[PDB]
Nucleic acid binder design. Structure first.
Ligand SMILES: Nc1ncnc2c1ncn2[C@@H]1O[C@H](C[C@@H](N)CC[C@H](N)C(=O)O)[C@@H](O)[C@H]1O
Ligand SMILES: Nc1ncnc2c1ncn2[C@@H]1O[C@H](C[C@@H](N)CC[C@H](N)C(=O)O)[C@@H](O)[C@H]1O
Ligand SMILES: OC[C@H]1O[C@@](CO)(O[C@H]2O[C@H](CO)[C@@H](O)[C@H](O)[C@H]2O)[C@@H](O)[C@@H]1O
Ligand SMILES: OC[C@H]1O[C@@](CO)(O[C@H]2O[C@H](CO)[C@@H](O)[C@H](O)[C@H]2O)[C@@H](O)[C@@H]1O
Lengths: 249, 249
DNA sequence: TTGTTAACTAGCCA
DNA sequence: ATGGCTAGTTAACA
DNA sequence: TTGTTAACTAGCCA
DNA sequence: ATGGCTAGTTAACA
């Protein structure tokens, strides 16, 4: 694999010790949500106080690995977001809560509540001096839409000419099973979302840690965009897929 | 003043005794977020532990008013939601976390974080047997979309023939100052989303409590849908607007 | 145009 | 305390 | 077609 | 301690 792409087929909680502290620029964490999915293991078969307990366990291993300029995005479900976010706010400062609007709702058959269509992303920072560069993640307008938004009072503004902030709600559809990007993983994440996080919060060439990389989506994002990557995945097939994904760019 | 609609220019926290315990079917709470706004008072000038203590205070007076079949929606900001939702999960059960996608981002000037385009809403219930009816709030398809979505596998399905679950992300644009629904209030909530709350979670004839009603958006929703309403707002200018909005029906 | 499917069924009754 | 049966669930990829 | 604005800048310096 | 100054911020209503 490319230079700084480290794919470790190891359990993160037993191998984090090997990771030097204050050595990571960004953590992109998409840990098991506690939703009972089949990852080839029981990672997502915990729930309630056990899952929160386990979530603190790995969080405490990972946080020290952050450089004083580093940041972290952590995916979770509204079912455990308040407790997780509350805990992280005693360790880090929360810069943002990003809502990933997945467009395609979860199935089931319910009629007694609203259907799930968002995941929660918590954007945290070690200190007020965190690295964040908006320019590479700015969304430029097409011609028609730029014409619709332009006004004398805005002419020349950066948001208008270079592009606008993605905001705290990211509308990006889940990857259909037949989507070109899809691989044999149950909980894949659109590269679009992961790349944005990598480009705005990791200095180019910086190091990004993904404690539970699955298909190496973060790896791919770091490969392109030129950034370093350390990642752990217990499932060997996932580690496999990941290598494949990174050895195709 | 229509019958069933009752409006008060008082502090809820001090008049809660007047509200019989277990008399309300739904609480639509759009309380101060803790963001520095000026409602003619300093209610939104609290922050940190001081905001949350006040938040959990009025919450403790409101909850016992909910009948066993009751439910609640509480608007809040990501900056205090994890704490608020964590506290409420110890009292009630959380059925959903609804994201209000405001569409129009907050202004300021930053480039150091993601701009805000969502407020948070916690949907809670006293008991597992909470009232909830989706049919009044199903979103029907237009000829074009129904055609795009229809497949033999889905033909005859309630969600296709009648309309879909609005989901837990609600993309409804904030009300522009020049919008015909806009009245002189700094933080008005679109009736579209308040009405949805009233329709799904309050039986026709039920009583709705809004402890910080502001401009009366919940009063109007109930009036238009045949629900009873009780509301509180310490600012009389706002209270007058609420009278007007209700009376113009 | 179409087959297919994706991190987040649930209330009864037995 | 625990299943299983039912009526029920969408946007977008190929 | 264009004016205008909405629940949530942020760091520096005299 | 405290303004003030800076570079800077969008979709949609009328
Ligand atoms: N202790 C552990 N160490 C490393 N990986 C783990 C551990 N426990 C669970 N996992 C993996 O973490 C992954 C969580 C997934 N959400 C990762 C998905 C990944 N973001 C993707 O886009 O493909 C699963 O594939 C698990 O197998
Ligand atoms: N103790 C209190 N009792 C009643 N109202 C209060 C109290 N404290 C603050 N408020 C009001 O609560 C309101 C909160 C607003 N967000 C209401 C807006 C309302 N949802 C609307 O759509 O117009 C403000 O108008 C405050 O003045
Ligand atoms: O408020 C529901 C919320 O609680 C969670 C964990 O945060 O589950 C806990 O509470 C449930 C209450 O219905 C219990 O069923 C469950 O056993 C307990 O762990 C989430 O499941 C849910 O989002
Ligand atoms: O700090 C950004 C600041 O700009 C404000 C201040 O009024 O307003 C925006 O909209 C105004 C109405 O025309 C413009 O005059 C102003 O230049 C523009 O930035 C607020 O939205 C915001 O706090």
């Amino acid at each position: 694999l490319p230079s700084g792409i480290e794919l470790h087929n190891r359990d993160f909680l037993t191998d984090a010790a090997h990771l030097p502290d204050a050595s990571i620029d960004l953590i992109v964490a998409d840990p098991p949500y506690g939703l009972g999915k089949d990852y080839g293991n029981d990672s997502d078969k915990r729930s309630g106080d056990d899952f929160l307990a386990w979530t603190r366990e790995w969080l405490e291993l990972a946080i020290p690995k952050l450089k004083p300029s580093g940041s972290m995005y952590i995916f979770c479900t509204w079912q455990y977001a308040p407790e997780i976010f509350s805990f992280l706010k005693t360790q880090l400062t929360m810069v943002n809560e990003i809502i990933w609007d997945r467009r395609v709702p979860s199935m089931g058959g319910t009629t007694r509540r609203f259907t799930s269509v968002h995941d929660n992303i918590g954007f945290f920072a070690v200190s007020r001096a965190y690295y964040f560069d908006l320019d590479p993640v700015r969304i430029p307008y097409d011609a028609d839409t730029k014409k619709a938004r332009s006004r004398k009072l805005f002419e020349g503004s950066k948001w208008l000419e270079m592009g606008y902030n993605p905001k705290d709600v990211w509308s990006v559809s889940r990857l259909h099973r037949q989507h070109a990007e899809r691989v044999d993983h149950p909980t894949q994440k659109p590269l679009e979302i992961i790349e944005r996080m990598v480009l705005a919060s990791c200095p180019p060439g910086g190091r990004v840690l993904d404690p539970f990389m699955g298909s190496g989506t973060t790896a791919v994002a770091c490969a392109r965009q030129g950034r370093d990557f350390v990642g752990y995945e217990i499932n060997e097939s996932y580690c496999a897929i990941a290598h494949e994904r990174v050895n195709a760019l």
